[PDB]
Subunit: 320 residues, 5 copies
C-alpha cells in the first residue's frame, strides 16, 4: 500500500522504459529527500543534489546527467507526445540545436519547447473565436445583441485570463533563474557531476553561456505570447464599450420616435374630445345649422395638424 | 491589577502547559523589553535578543531555543488546534519535514503551515459561493436579476478583498526576510544561543540554507493563493459587465415591442377619429345613403392596416 | 516690520516657553541659513548643520540636542496638545519608550506619534460615515436612491482620497530615510554634537539601531493605515457597481409591467373600435336584429381576452 | 541663407545683449558639434564639453561658466520675463539663494524656478474652473445636465492630462540626474573649467552638495504639483460616477410615475368600454329601465377606482 | 530545394548588390551557427561572434565591420527606401552625424532612424483621424451618434493599441542594451575585429560613449512617441465618458417630455369619460334641461385644465 510513481525513463540513447517504483526507492536511487519531490508548486524549476526538478502544471520531470524521468503521466494524453517525439528529439537530428551539448541541455530544451508549444496552441485556438464573436457583436445594424454569443464570450474571456496567468508564471520562473548567475552555474549538472573530467573536457565552450542563451530565447517567446494576450484583452474591453454606446444610441432613437407618435396621439385625442362632447344626448341650439358639421370636422382636422406641427417644432427646439 | 498574559508553553518534548504570567515577569524571563512585546503590527516577524516574535492577526507567538509560547489565545477556537496538533507536530513524525533540525525550525514550520491552511480554507470556502452566484446571475433567460443574490455577491466580494489583502501582507512579510541574508542568519536562534557548541555540532549542514528553503516554500504557496484570488476578482468583474449588457439588451427588446404596439394604437385611434366625428348629433347630407356605412367602415379598417404597415416599414428602415 | 516666528521652546526638562523671534536672530542662534527654514515642502524631514528640520502640513519643528522648537503654531488648536502632553511626554514616564535615550529620540517619537494619531483619528472618523451611507444606498427594496446621501458620499470620498495621499506621503518620507544608512547616522544629533564625549558615553548601545527600530515601527503603522484606506476605496467602488445593477433591474421590471399594460390597452382599443364604428349615425340593415347587440358585445369581450392572452404569450416567448 | 539662431546673452554682471549668429559660428564659439544643439528632445538636460544644454518645451538655453544664452525666444511672450527678471535675478539680491555660489548655480536655479512657476500657474488656473464645473454638474436638483459645461469639462480634462504629462517628464529628468553622482559632478562647470584654480578656491564648500540640494528642492516641488494633479483627476472621476447615478435615479422616478399614470389610464379605458358598448345604435331590452343609467355610471366609476387601487397595490408589492 | 535568403549587401562605399544565397553558405561566410539566424523574436538586437543581428518586425539585418546585409526584403515596399536612401546615408553627407565614426555606427543609426520614422509616420497618420472622429462624436446637439464613426473609432483604437505595443517593445529593447556596459562594449564590432589596430587607431575617442549617446537619443525619441500615444488613449476614454453622459441627458429630457404629455392625455381621457357616459342610449332625467350641455362641457374643459396644472405641479415638486 506504499505510494508509488509511474516513471517513464529516457536514457542518453533515446530508449524509453515505463514502469512503477516505490517513492522510497526513487528517493534512494536519485539521492533526494522526500520533501524535494513533493511537487507542491505549479511551474517550479529547482536544482537539488545535482538533480533538476521541474513541474509545469500536470508535467513532472526529473533530469539527471544520465537520464530523464517523467512522473505521473497517465490519463493526460501525453503518450503520443512522449513516444512519438521524445526519442527522436533527445537522440536525433530534430529541431533541437543543442546536440553537441550534454544531455541536460537537450532535456531542458525539449521540456521548454513542449510547454511553449502548448501555450501557443492555446492562444491560437482562443484568438479566432474571440475575434469572430466580437465582430458579430459589434454589428451596428442589430437592435439587440445575441445572448448566447455573450455567454461564449464570457467563457472565452475566462479561458484567456487563465492563459495569461499561466504565461506570467512561466515568464517569472525563467526570469528568476536568469537573474542570478549561481542558479545558471548550478543548472549545468553534467559539469558538476564530474568536475575533474569536465575541467579538461570542455574545449573552451562555456556551459553557462549556452544555458543563458537558451533561457533567454524561451523567455522572449513567452514575452511575445504575453503581449499578444494583453492586446486581445484590450480589444475585448474596447468592443464592450462600443457595444454599450450602440445600445444606448438605439434606445435614444426608439424613444424619440415613440415620443413623436405620443405627441400625435395626444393631439388627436385632444381634438376628438370636441366630437365626443358633441356626441352626448343633450339638447343644444346648434342642431338646425347645416354647415356646422362640416365646419366642426374641418376645424378639428386642421387644428390637429397645426398643433401636431407646433408640438414637433417645440420638440426640435428642445433637442436642438 | 497588573496586566497579564495567558501563556501556553510547549517544550522540546511536546508537553503543553497553560498558565498566566505578569507582563513584567515575562519580560524578565524572556530577556526582552516591554516595547518588544507590544504586538502593535499585524503579521510581523522579528528577532530580538535571540528570540523570535511573531504575530499573525489573532495569533501571537514567541519562539526560544528551548520552548515556544502562545499568548492571548482564549476565545479564539484555537484550543482544538493547539491540543490536538501541536504536541504531535512538534514532537512526532507528522507532516513536518524538519525533525532532525533544531526546535525553532519545527516551530516556524508549524506556525506558517497553520496560517497557510487558514488562508487556503478561507479561499476554498469563498470560491464555490461566488462561482454559483455568478452562474445564477448571468443567466440570459432572466429579464431581471435577483437582488438578494446581489447582496450576497457584495458581501462575498468584500470578504475576498480582505482575504487578498491578508495574502499580500503575508507574502510581503516573508519576502522581506528572504531578501536579506542577515535576517536569515539571525533566525537561527539555536546556532547563536551557544555558538561554540554549534560550531562543531553542525555536521556540515547549513541552517541558513534550510531556513531559506522553508521560507521559499511558504512564499510560493502564498503566491499561488494570491494568483487564485486575483483570477476570481477578474471573473467577478467580467460577469458584472456581461450582466450590464444583458439588461441593456432586454430593455431594448421591450422598448422596440412597446414602440410597435404604440404605432398600432396610434393608427387605430387616428382612423377611429373618423367614426367619432360621424357619431356626433349634427345634421348631414349622407344619412340617406345605404352603402355609405359599410364603405366608411371598410375604408377605416383597410387604411388602418395600410398605415400600420407603412409605419412598421418606416421603423424598420430607421433601425436598419 | 521684519518677519518673525512665534516660537515655542521645550528644554530637556520639559519646561515650555513661548515667545517671538526675528527670522535673522533665529538663523543666527540655530546656526542655519535662511534657505534651510523656508518650509516650502509639506511633510519633509531633513538634517542641516546637526539640526533636524521637520514639517508635517501645519506643524513645523526644529530639533536640537538641547531643546525643541515649534514654529507658527497659533490658530491651529495645537495649544491643548502642546501644553497638556508635550511636557509630560518629553520629561516623564508617559507612553514614550525611549526615556534612557537622548532627547532627540523622545522628540522624534513624540512628533511621529502625534502625526500618526491624527491620521488614525481621521480614518476612524471617516469609516463609519462611509459604511452607513453605503449600507443605506445599497438597500435592494428602494426604487430610487436618495441624492443627499450621494452628495455626502462624494464629500467623504474626496476626504478619503486626501487622507490616502497624506498617508502615502508620510510613508515615502520615512522610507527614504530608512533606505540609506547615512541619513540614519546623521539623525543622531547628540552623538555628533560632541563625538569625543559620546565615543565613550555610549555603553555599547547603537543609536542608529534605535533610530531604525523607531522609524520601522512608525512606517509599519502607516502601512496598516494605507491598507485600511485602500480597502475602503475598493468597497466604495463595489457598492457603486451594485447600485447601478439594482437601478437597471428596477427599470427593467417597471418597463415590463408598463409593456404588459400597454398590450392590454391596445387590445381594448382595437376591439372597442367595433363599437365606435357601430355608434355612428348611418343607416344599416342590422338594427332590426334583437340578439345582435349582445352577440357583438360578447364577441368583443371574448376576443379582447383572447388577443390579450395571445399577445402575452408572444411577449413571454420573445423574452424566453 | 545659412540657418541662424536668435541669441540673448547674459553675462556674469546681468547685462543682456540680443543678436543673431550663424549656427556654424555658434558651434565654433561654444566648442560644440552640431548634433549637440539639435534640441530634438523636449525637457532634456545634458552636459557636453563642459557646457550645459537645457530644453523645456519652447525654452532653449546654453549655460557656460562665463555667460548664459537663450536661443529662439521670439514670438513666445518671453521678452517681459527676460528683460524684467533675469538681470535682477542673476546679478542682484533677488529670490535666488545661491549668490555666493558660481554663475551656473544662479542660472540653473533661475531656469528651474521659471519652469516650476509656469507649471504652478497652469495648475492654479485649471483648478477653480474644474471645481466650479463639477460643483454645477453634480447638483442633485437638476433633471438633466448642461452640455456646454460638459464640453468645457472635457477641454479642461485634456489640458489637465497634458499638464500632468509635463510634470511627470520634469520629475523624471531631474531624478535621472539626481540618481547618479557622475552627472552631479559634471554639472559643476566652473569647477572643471579651471580645476587648478578651484582646487584651492573652494574654501571647504562642496559644489556637488549644493547642486544636489537645489535639484532635490525642485524635485520635491514637482512632486507636490503631481500629487495635486492626480487628486484633481480622481475627483473628476468620482463626480462623473455621481452624475451617472443621479441621472439613473431621475429616470427611475419618472418611469415609475409614468407607469402609475398608465395604469390609471388603462383602468379608465377598460371601464369606459362599457359605455362605448352601450352607446351603439342597436336594439336592447334595457332602455325602459330608469335607474339603469345611474347604476351603470356608478358601477363604472366605483370599479375604476377599485381596479386602480388594486393595480397600485400590485405594483407596490412587485417593487417591494 | 535548400532554403535560401534574398540578400542585399551594402559595402563601406555605399555600393548595393542584390542576390540569393543558401542558408548554409551564409552561415559559413558570416561565421555564425544556424540558431543565430532563426529570427524568431520580433525587435531583437544581439551580438554574436562579433556580428550584429537585428530584427524589427519585417526588417532583418546583419551588420559586419565590412558590410551590411538585409535579408528577406521582397514584397515589403522597401526597395524605394533601400535604393534611394541607404547608398546616400551610408556613404555620403546626409542626415547621419556619425560619418567619421566606423561603419557600424552609420548602419545602426540608419536602421534606428528608419524604424523611428516609421513609428512617427504611423502616429501622425493615426492622430488626425481619431481627433476628428472624437470631435464629431461629442457634438452636444446630436440626439444620437453615428455608428459608422463608432466602427471607424474602434478600428483606429485597435491600430493605436498595436502601435503603442510596438513603441513599448522598441523602448525595452534599447533600454536593455543601455543598462549594461558589456553589451555597449560588444556593440563596437570594428574595435574588437582588430583590437591591435584600434588600440592605437582610436585617437582618444571613446566608441562606447558614442554608442551610448546614439542609443540614448533614440530611446528619448521613442519615449516621446509613447507619451503621445498614451495621451491619445486617455483622450479617447474621456470622450467616451462624455458621450455616455450626453446620451443619458438626452434620454432624460425626452422621458420628461413624454411624461408630461402622458399626464395631459390621461387628464383628457378622464374628463372625456363623462361625455362618454352621457353618450349612451339610456333614459335619464336631464334631457329637458337647456343649459346642462354647455355647463357639462365647460366643467369638463375647466376641470381638465385644472387637473393638468395640478399634476404638473406635483411632477415639479417630485423632481424638485
Ligand atoms: Cl435606460
Amino acid at each position: 500500500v506504499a505510494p508509488v510513481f509511474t516513471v517513464t525513463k529516457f536514457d542518453k540513447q533515446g530508449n524509453v522504459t515505463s514502469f512503477e517504483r516505490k517513492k522510497t526507492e526513487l528517493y534512494q536511487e536519485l539521492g533526494l529527500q522526500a520533501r524535494d519531490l513533493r511537487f507542491q508548486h505549479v511551474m517550479s524549476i529547482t536544482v537539488r543534489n545535482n538533480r533538476i526538478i521541474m513541474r509545469m502544471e500536470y508535467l513532472k520531470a526529473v533530469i539527471t546527467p544520465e537520464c530523464l524521468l517523467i512522473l505521473d503521466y497517465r490519463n493526460l494524453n501525453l503518450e503520443q507526445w512522449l513516444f512519438r517525439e521524445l526519442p527522436s528529439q533527445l537522440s536525433g537530428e530534430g529541431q533541437l540545436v543543442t546536440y553537441p551539448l550534454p544531455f541536460e541541455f537537450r532535456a531542458i530544451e525539449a521540456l521548454l519547447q513542449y510547454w511553449i508549444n502548448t501555450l501557443q496552441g492555446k492562444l491560437s485556438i482562443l484568438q479566432p473565436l474571440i475575434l469572430e464573436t466580437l465582430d458579430a457583436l459589434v454589428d451596428p445594424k442589430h437592435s439587440s445583441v445575441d445572448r448566447s454569443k455573450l455567454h461564449i464570450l464570457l467563457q472565452n474571456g475566462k479561458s484567456l485570463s487563465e492563459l495569461e496567468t499561466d504565461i506570467k508564471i512561466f515568464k517569472e520562473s525563467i526570469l528568476e533563474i536568469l537573474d542570478e548567475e549561481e542558479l545558471l552555474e548550478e543548472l549545468c549538472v553534467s559539469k558538476w557531476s564530474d568536475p575533474q573530467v569536465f575541467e579538461k573536457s570542455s574545449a573552451g565552450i562555456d556551459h553557462a553561456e549556452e544555458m543563458e542563451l537558451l533561457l533567454e530565447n524561451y523567455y522572449r517567446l513567452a514575452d511575445d505570447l504575453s503581449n499578444a494576450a494583453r492586446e486581445l484583452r484590450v480589444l475585448i474591453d474596447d468592443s464592450q464599450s462600443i457595444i454599450f454606446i450602440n445600445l444606448d444610441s438605439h434606445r435614444n432613437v426608439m424613444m424619440r420616435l415613440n415620443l413623436q407618435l405620443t405627441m400625435g396621439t395626444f393631439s388627436l385625442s385632444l381634438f376628438g374630445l370636441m366630437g365626443v362632447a358633441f356626441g352626448m344626448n343633450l339638447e343644444s341650439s346648434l342642431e338646425e345649422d347645416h354647415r356646422i358639421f362640416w365646419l366642426i370636422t374641418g376645424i378639428m382636422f386642421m387644428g390637429s395638424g397645426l398643433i401636431w406641427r407646433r408640438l414637433l417644432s417645440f420638440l426640435g427646439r428642445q433637442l436642438e
